[model samples]
Target: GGLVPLELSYDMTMDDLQFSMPMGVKMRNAVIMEPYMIEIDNSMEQLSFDHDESYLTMLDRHGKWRVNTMIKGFASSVQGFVSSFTTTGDIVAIGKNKADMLLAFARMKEIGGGIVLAENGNILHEIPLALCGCASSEAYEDVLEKEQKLRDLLTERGYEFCDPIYTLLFLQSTHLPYIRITPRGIFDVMKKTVLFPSIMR
Candidate 1:
């Protein structure tokens, strides 16, 4: 119900030499091999199993094999609003300033769970993800209307893509890049490590 600090960036990778751990230790990489990736900092509270430690998550923009962004929203189910987009090399932030992160968090909560496209502290477009905070419960036609509406809004904001919402259903996956965010924290999928000792600065 509040805003939390999140560190987010793009183009990252992991190496055995970077971590002082045993071999076969599956590390998470933030590298976006695809053409584009939407990096989000949702301000949700970190899960307790992570010892309440914050983490940064990475994903491939075009691949559905991984859940790439972290969000802070209502619904508390840990499954929340997700959106996707194609890129023509543009990056944008939702909040107006540093304190706007809290406003963004509150707006998502007000809307339940949905794709919120905001800029400069204003909500340009939003579509509800009512089902498990990931899918809409509306009819196909209605969903299309909302999706198209949002798409137009995004295009106006300088984003170029083909049906950005087409792959919105499967936003989270653990199979690729071997790193994902869950209630426990950032997970090293292959090694089953929930908390990275190095991230505790």
Candidate 2:
């Protein structure tokens, strides 16, 4: 039960990401917006973060080349001896695994639809959409389709896409409330909304 020092880079020359690249700083882009500035330090080290149910890692922090660790999660359909799929109910895909999923949820939550969690009790990983995958059309489409699926995966998952989007949007719209992770935790400029105790719990 250790609280990691999530660092938020402030006032990067280009963007928070571009600025950190040269410093060998690999920080997980917080759930909110970029350039918001969190509390991570300048010591090239590995770190982990949990989004909903999925977990991720900050592998290496070299000058202009920060990498994330291999993602790992349980499979969805673990039936008998030789049957398995990476889709479970309790398992909520995070990071790249849930990129499309998140997008789907965003769409659904936006329209007041339901969401469903991944299959099985397993988790999924190894897909780094944040670095190089999230930008892909296929990934985006997959997530969108999944969200629009009749099963309503996003709603089933118990996540309201609008909530995360609102959180991100609020961070971007205002400057008073900080919206990035830092070494000391989140530097919420809008302390009341950003650091609200109810949300953290």
Candidate 3:
């Protein structure tokens, strides 16, 4: 009969992690090490026991690990509601006045879009949008002020804010890709540039 023998080898110095219990072994270095161990334990504890330990078999196995995480999006909270609206011509056309134009540009920028303003609403003087990529409550109010200034400026031009023509202008340009000023210039949404028409043209 051929001989069948069992053999095994293990490091005696290696600690048996399964048999170890929390010993309250404190150390100055624990400040750093404790957090790491806690994280590991928390992660491991999330998984169910692997078929439970079998003393008769002297073997144990762990199940698949589970973890909790989060998903981030274009907006973080309610404040992001205004900050995350998509570009529309009407929204862009809100810049009839210099201040209004600045606010429109600022609002666009607060949500991560590029912006530009021309002496007139032209398409030749495009510039990078500034003010960073995030907005707060204060910035939103500032935009409102610009809108008011624009309303007053138009009213002085013998054009009531409620005039059909002015209203149409607002409605027209608000949804257009380019922000146009009657005599100022045009702001390009795609290229973020300014285009000014020559008087000769």
Candidate 4:
């Protein structure tokens, strides 16, 4: 299924996250960098993308925000604020019900990587993902410390945030939340914690 609500366990944690790429979009690994940044269209096709096992990033046309997952498969570069990435791995943490996703995220941190997110092209935070995604105190506090900063910006824009930062790795549907990025403000997604506003929320 594409873009459906995620399956949750009794504890409200992600249980099964099924995903598949939609049509009318190109899928590739090791993408070529372009000199100029192309303006992304905030349309049906652009609102969503594929959810395979890869650390990736993207620029939402609506939010105009730059979000990234700092996993170690491929370190991508943004051209004109447009970016792309891919990887070679099956049984991704895309399914948060298991530790596969958490372990992969942990591996990235064992090196030197975490979820890097920015708004309006300014680096806002680097939430470290431990062996268990945001379950680790480091990443939890990382998000907590940024709460005021996030509030300041949201307050300045007169937007109410339903969730804070959703840039961390977690279990859920393969396709990430998109429409949450609206003119009103972004309603992110993450479970059992307030990392990003939840699409489910």
Residue 56's lDDT in candidate 4? 27
Model 1 spans with C-alpha error above 4 angstroms: 1-98, 130-138, 152-172, 195-201
lDDT of 3 by residue, 111-148 (tens): 34333322233321222222222356656655445445
Candidate models: Cα lDDT each: 0.33, 0.25, 0.24, 0.26
Q: The CA-based lDDT of model 4 is what?
A: 0.26
**TM-score of every model?**
0.40, 0.26, 0.20, 0.25
- Per-residue CA lDDT of candidate 4, range 1-201, in tens? 113311211111122221121211111222211111112222211121222223223222222332222222121221011111112111122221123333333332333433322333343333332322346676776556655554454334322323322222121223343212222222232322222321221
Worst 10 residues of 3 by lDDT: 52-61
Candidate 2 colliding pairs, count: 44
TM-score result, candidate 1: 0.40
Ranking by lDDT: 1, 4, 2, 3
* lDDT of each residue in 71-174, candidate 2, tens digit only: 12211221101101111111121232323333322332232222323223232211222221135675786654443541243233433444322322232233
lDDT of 2 at 14: 15
Model 2 gets an lDDT of: 0.25
Higher-TM-score candidate of 1 and 4 = 1
Which candidate model has the greater TM-score, 1 or 3?
Answer: 1
Error of 3 at 71 (Å): 47
